[PDB]
Amino acid sequence: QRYALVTGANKGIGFEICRQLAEKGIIVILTSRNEKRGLEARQKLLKELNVSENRLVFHQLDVTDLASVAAVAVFIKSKFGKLDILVNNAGVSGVEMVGDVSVFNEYIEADFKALQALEAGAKEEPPFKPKANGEMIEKFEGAKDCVVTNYYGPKRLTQALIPLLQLSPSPRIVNVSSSFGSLLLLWNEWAKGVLGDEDRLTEERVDEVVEVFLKDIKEGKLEESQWPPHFAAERVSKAALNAYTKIAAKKYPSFRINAICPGYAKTDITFHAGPLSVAEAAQVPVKLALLPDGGPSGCFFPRDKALALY
Ligand SMILES: NC(=O)c1ccc[n+]([C@@H]2O[C@H](COP(=O)([O-])OP(=O)(O)OC[C@H]3O[C@@H](n4cnc5c(N)ncnc54)[C@H](OP(=O)(O)O)[C@@H]3O)[C@@H](O)[C@H]2O)c1
Ligand SMILES: CC1=C(C=O)C(C)(C)CCC1
Secondary structure: OOOEEEEEOHHHHHHHHHHHHHHOOOEEEEOOOHHHHHHHHHHHHHHHHHHOHHEEEEEEOOOOOHHHHHHHHHHHHHOOOOOOOEEEEOOOOOOOEEEEEOHHHHHHHHHHHHHHHHHOOOOOOOOOOOOOEEEEOOOOHHHEEEEEEHHHHHHOOOOOOOOOOOOOOOEEEEOOOHHOOOHOOOOOHHHHHHOOOOHHOOOOHHHHHHHHHHHHOOOOOOOOOOOOOHHHHHHHHHHEEEEEEEEHHHHOOEEEEEEEEOOOOOHHHHOOOEEEEEHHHHHHHHHHHHOOOOOOOOEOOHHHHHHOOO
16 A cells, blocks of 8 residues: 655645546545645545545645644654655745736746757847736745745655655655756856756755845845846746755665656646646656656656656
């Protein structure tokens, strides 16, 4: 019997990760920061799955609350005694929209094009301003929430769950990341060098990168300090997550710990734009959660590479 914990599972990709893992016979701990949303999600998913009540368990979990993190570990130890799969899916964007919310999607599409060009050898991300009558506002509070949810959350939950995962015969961690964490998009040369220097990577060095970023946005210095012009907190947080994925895979060599991009999928975070359904997106993290023993660890996989792994 295998047990999987999925964070941010009341909606979006995380909800579908729960569906797909439960369909594979894994006992799923569906977690969410809001109790009512998570209980309702469990009820809906249990109905749709049409399976026995024991297949899907709810527990509260806010990945930014250290008490909540500790209590979920106590719960798993008492009820199940081990954990086999951790999916760090919860995430936020750090952006507030003013006006036409579809500007958010315009930025995503611009960024995908920029990434493709940079991966093909171009040396700069083109400036971009949107067409529609909206704007993405990126303030300190949202940036802090993004880093704490998207980077410290997976780090702290991983750390809290090591003892339980160590009791699995095939421990798996999947970090739902983004191709926008690419160092090519990070702008900050110091941070790119630190995160890119894999042999010297430590948790302390990654923490320093994200804390320097937060101080800069607090002080209104994002441009002058060479951070991204937009999606700054998202990019920093996913880059940091990718780096922590490598750190953790090295520290816990018997585990398989990987980061993925699920693809651009219609969820609340994207204002329900993007080519993929939530069910399609969840195929990616589920693929890495079910990776056979001996498979890659410490890697970042975009969607098509993840799905081709086996
Ligand atoms: N959709 C895409 O195109 C896309 C692409 C690449 C990567 N991703 C990643 O996919 C992940 C899932 O996002 P989504 O697209 O499914 O968006 P979503 O529909 O907004 O779902 C986000 C989930 O994260 C939960 N969450 C936020 N803060 C949390 C916290 N502190 N503690 C616990 N749960 C928290 C949210 O709960 P509430 O309901 O309480 O807010 C929600 O359940 C994210 O990490 C995102 O970065 C998405
Ligand atoms: C990393 C990133 C996100 C989460 O994956 C979006 C899709 C919410 C906006 C673009 C930057």
